[model samples]
Target: APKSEVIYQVMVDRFYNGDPSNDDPEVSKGMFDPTHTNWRMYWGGDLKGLTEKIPYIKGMGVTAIWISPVVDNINKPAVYNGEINAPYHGYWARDFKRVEEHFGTWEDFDNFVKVAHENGIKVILDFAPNHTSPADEENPDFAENGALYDDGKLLGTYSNDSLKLFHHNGSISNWNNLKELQDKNLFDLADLDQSNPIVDKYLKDSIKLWFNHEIDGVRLDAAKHMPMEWVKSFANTIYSIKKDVLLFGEWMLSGPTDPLYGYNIQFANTTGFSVLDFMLNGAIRDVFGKGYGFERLNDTLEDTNKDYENPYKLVTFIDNHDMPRFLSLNNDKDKLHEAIAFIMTTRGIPVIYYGTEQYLHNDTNGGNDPYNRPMMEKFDESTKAYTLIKELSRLRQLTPALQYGTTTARYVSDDVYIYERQYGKDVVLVAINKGEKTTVKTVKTSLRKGIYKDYLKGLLKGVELKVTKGNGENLVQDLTLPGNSVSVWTNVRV
Candidate 1:
């Protein structure tokens, strides 16, 4: 097996507690107190905490771990509900170069990566390039003396002496405009004038520093908000320094066809990197649950390839840290399992969010952030759905077809989906049922009659018993797919 791969994302605050000494109620602004909030609040999950769980994660067959940003956040207490708040989530970046004391020291992080690599697991750090902390005004290095530019734009100078902040007239005029939020950072937040060579040098140096520490990759947050030209230059520069580092971006949009797309297309391609494919995620769920069938998945893939140079480089996930888990959306374990099977078996790299296997959901603010993120807990690993994912991911590593093959749909319906992945002589077949138990009445494939192995059910040398049904007709077999179950078969040449 070529090291079956899966990326597990964890909200450090909700993962585990390995250190209690740094749990400061004052510096963390009382958020560190577990009593203030349940698992939703900081429960003292830190670098030392994740370091302790490397074996636990690796044992689950995961190949990589993606942690939230480790940058310094505002030292001042954030007030939420008129009370001292917690800002340990790390979205608020106080200083790019410094590590948040609440999380752990810089050396702790360095060791975390070292430990992960020791276990054959890669580490991807979350990064926010679009904006800095709202409290940047307090920083002496801020472009202005804590002044909010009326036009809302910041300026960068080549020399250390000329960096300044200005208002660029609110990239979008309407206060209610969503685009305003996108451009606000450029105008409102501590927007870096990437146009400046000196600013570029500083940002690149900051990234190289982390790379030197042995970081494997980065998850670029809010990628659309930044200028593509800057992104291309930044990624190109980073790759030039460290060619092996993976650069993935968050381009959160529903489907590739959506008019008001949430990603920057030209930049993603021009940058020589990949993005998190939100489009395929939504389409697969909607099509499978709603009976749109393989058409939607096929269409989306074709559209993406048409728009981007290399669609395969993109990372695909059915649900992530930012959205409701697949089970939460419908609460159908079978359907969720089917979605997971498809994602794991699909061509692109699959990433799994923590607590998903446990069916975790809080429904916070309509299932928004801080709510979508829940504490990790024990759950059934033997469920058909869970097993399906593990098996498929393992198969992907073992079989060249599942990992790099071209896919084609054989049969699709509102209740059942069948697809085949082929890479030369290697071929793998996948079937999923989200509703009632289904007996694939007929299966169409290029292979002639032969015995195959059912990896999902652990059936060896399973004879391909012939059905009376014609080639085009549905072939009814004793094989019954329980509601929300997935089946995978690998045909070996005799």
Candidate 2:
């Protein structure tokens, strides 16, 4: 089994602007927004910018980096409700084999991968095989009609469907129907019919092209919108090309009670892939961001753990580009810090969205899309969130119990929760106080009969723990937890 890694996801066009030369190389007009006033246009971030910030990212103890898609995007911007929608986010693909000029040439991406790997960091690519750009058959002029290319050769278009590459069904209206979900266009984007031989071969061959660059992992964009057999074949193709490539998907689920929660898990189990842990993310938002009870968070954690075959592989996050930043929901920085600590110490592989350490959040429209994906303005390592992430990330690297241990809730309450993770003799215990400071009478733990120091060194105001052997168990009596703080103790030498 692969060890857990801390992944930092960067929206490539928003992280940094290292190479001004490639920022709007005449690939298309009116798409570049250097003034940063328009949220839909490019902000001049590219592979070089991300590469130059390798030291900054590595300083946070990140072991892996997940970047947005680099493939050549649509040459023209799409018009949705009279607003120009640019491919600055890199979700609209036009050419699969070439690098997006807005991002950089192929050499720039190669240098990024090389530089990241040199710093002992793995790279994960965001792959959106679910669709091309938004298109309409009647108006082929609308964003290239979702035209796809193969190394400069025109493959097919939504209007010109002699190849039968794209699904002819119009934009999806009934989202609940599985046929529409798998076959219809997702908000006007051209949905690719992977069951078609040409489509399957093209998609698989294009992914193989990127594998040649030696990326460590891939994140499928919309797993719920594709057929399972085709996704299975796609996973098999990638595995055949490279043995150890990690594959995760964007199968969004609002909560565990959603009708398709089990269906999503079955998809992962069948395809040998893990999914982004959205169920827990929603619960975290409800508890930490909305002041819900800790029992909700604990129940979500336990339910998700039992639901997934191997919960450790699930990609866990508090917020991402698609949703509001954690700070936007509540202006309280302490709550944000607690949420970050909870995800870092809990099970599953953790992903920290770029600019989160600097407390990035835009509350316009409640920090919805485009506002949530803001251009990173600062890299102040002195911020408390940055320091907390740095310290906890380091502990995550050194503590084996933090990586693959089984989670056992030693204590749970309305405002406080204490969980213990143990793998054989290795043990890591975490206590969170989301409310006022309180004293617990007694808490059971998996730590052997011994004393342990806080690995975080009081970064989050964590305290030391004294474990004593009991009648067939270990206990920490009369433990005091601070208000709005987190404490982590691990048996692993730090």
Candidate 3:
């Protein structure tokens, strides 16, 4: 598995429309809302579009790209409650063996992977082994195109007598029950019977097929809805085929950082699955988005250090396709700066939602999903947030301490937050202030007494950070942080 410091999450359909020829004429008109109003609508982004924009992605300091699934989707649109649904987002797969026609052929996908790899960017495909498309109102056996087995052979549908391919228990009406969540349908989609060894082998083999393309890893979708026994078997099977395959599961629970509100993270050892740090995500929303103070964030990080077994492996993000954008909840641009600074500097592998640096979020009705996933309309490389991430991500890439270092909180208050990353003899200091109040904090760090210049000086409000054994005393040395500013100082002494 590739150890990427920064990940860029792309909802492929909304990314770019490089080729207009592949748009599905069958559903194109009904699938899109010209006023940009529909959440379930398609905007016609495809593999060619993603490949064409590799330079822009690399320019932003993204080392890995996690794209929505490429597997062929259901041919027709599914409608629920009068709202037409399009699988342009690539999650509802009807044929795992084939690539989505709208996203181009295997040629475009291969080329996409090639270009990304050539540019030193790893590609992580979004995979869903949990279920197939909802058996449309018209068809019960949505397997019209035929699904594949682990051995690359065709397997028929739920109606089969010899093959127990899909779980027949209706859409889940109760989400709280463990049995219902795992065995029943998710959002009315057909659930694949993972309990069968044949199904397990097929799922593993299907993923291995992708691995054959030399893709780095998979961001497993709806993993929590799948049983752990299957998760373990699936991961182990993939590892047997491709030893370096990384399994990033979506537990989707809020951080255990708050005992009273959030649930505990699953044991990663169970499925050999690395997960997204929803715990830390909760803290980001609370502190940066909800004005809960930098202190709340500081404490959350400290708690994460204790809560997670492998902190660095957990993928971290503030907002995602399932939720509202961070700015929707909190429009404080300064807080966004602080959030970016912390994620770039923090323990987990930071994942920047595609339009985040563009300050992309729907202000109308609080930017919820589908609303949160807007088309990538434009990109200005020189924007403040964009520039800030460029420098910060570069720092993350260059500094060994940031990736594998031990983190320690130096100061925590309503207005200020400071921390350090140390690996061996190296150290990098980071500080962020939330309110309109500056603070002078003396925090102990591994860096030797020196004058450290803020590398992000020109892009963001920075400080000439100083760390010293002031008055020749016991180990606490630090900086003066300005209100609503984030400063990252390397250990390069001047």
Candidate 4:
């Protein structure tokens, strides 16, 4: 098993602008919005900008960086709901074989990989092989008809796809129908037919090109929209090129009790690649973002850890580009801190969405996309959220128990959760209190009879714990936990 990682998810167009020349190059105009008033347009963030922030990302103790797709996107903007939305998100790929000029040239991408690798950070590329871009067969000019290219050579267009590389089943109208989900287009994006040998070769070869660039991992976009056998083949091809590449997919789930949760688990277990822990993410959002109980969060944890073949491989996150920011749902920063602390000390690989440490949240339209993804405006290192993530992320890197330990809930309550991660003698104890400050008593732990101080050092109002020998076992008695705070204690370091 690979060591657990702290991944920082960055939307390139909103991160920072390191090269002004690449912003809205002549081929793509009316997309660069310097004022940032137009959420649908690109702001000037490029590969150079991301490269420049390596030190900053490293400072947060992020082990890997998952950037949005870098493939060349459609020059024309797509009109939806009377809004001109650009391909700034990198999902509307026009050419899978080349880097988007709006982001930077191939040289810029190469330098970014090099710089990140030099800084001891791995790179994860967002790959959207499920589709090209939004297309309409009736109107060939609509978003380039989702035309795909290979190094500037047109492979085919949706309207003129005589080669039959795409599925013409139209957009998905019923998400509950599994066959429709995989066979149909997702929101007019020209869905690729993996059954076609040409499409399969093109998709596989495109990823092979990225692996040659020395990328360490890939986050498969819309994996649930693709067939399982095809995805398994995709994973096999990736591993064939690079044995250590990490591949995870996005299979969106609403909550732990989602009807398709079982199907999602089957896909994750058998697909050769792991997936984002939307099950845990939904629970975290409920407990921290909304006013839910810890018991509910613990319930999801139990199910995920038991159902997933390798729970440690699941990519855990509290928020991402698809949903509203955590702070947008709830304004309390401690709640965010507590949630961050929980994921860092948990079993799975933790991913912190970009600008989360800065408490970045836009309340516009209840913080849905294009609003959930606002330009990163601040980079303060002294913020409590930043320090909280830094301390916990560093601890996670050094602690083997946190990397792959089995999680056991020592204590559970409506607003408090105490869990112990034990890997032989290496142990990590985390206590989270979302309600009022209270004394937790008679909590059995893996820690030996000794005093354990907060590893976070008061970043989240951490508390000290005294473990005493009781009937040949260690027990924490009358431990005072601060309200809405997270306290972590470990035995290996002490």
* Residue pairs in collision within model 3: 255-279
Per-candidate clashes, comma-separated = 14, 0, 1, 0
TM-score of 1: 0.84
Q: Which 10-residue window in model 4 sums to the lowest lDDT?
A: 254-263
Best candidate, lDDT: 4
What TM-score, to 2 decimals, does candidate 2 have?
Answer: 0.98
Q: Tens-digit lDDT track for model 1 on 268-387?
A: 677765788777787876766555666677667657656756655668787776766665566665566667777787776788787666677776565666667676666456544445
Name the regions of candidate 3 deviating beyond 4 angstroms. Answer: 1-4, 25-37, 136-154, 157-162, 254-264, 470-478, 492-494
What candidate 4 gets wrong by more than 4 Å, as runs, is none
How far is each candidate from the true structure, as Cα RMSD in Å? 5.4, 1.2, 3.2, 1.1
| Alpha carbon lDDT at 224, candidate 2 | 90
TM-score sort, best first: 4, 2, 3, 1
Residue range with the least summed lDDT across 10 consecutive positions in model 1: 143-152
Off by over 4 Å in 1: 1-4, 25-29, 36-41, 80-85, 135-162, 165-183, 186-188, 254-257, 260-263, 288-294, 379-386, 458-482, 492-494
**lDDT, residue 450, candidate 4:** 80
- Local accuracy of candidate 3 as per-residue lDDT tens digits, 1-494: 22546899998888888887776555234564445567677777889999999998889899899998998776666776766878878888876777887788889999999999999898998999898776643454442322333323457544452587788787788666667878988876768888877677777768878888888888989877888777877777777777665568887673453332222255364677888887789988998887787767777788777767777787889889888888888887788878888888888688898988888877655677668888887877877888777777777766667767788887777777778887676678887777775657457666666677777883557787666655543244445566787777776432
Stronger candidate by lDDT (2 vs 3): 2
Candidate 4 accuracy as lDDT: 0.90
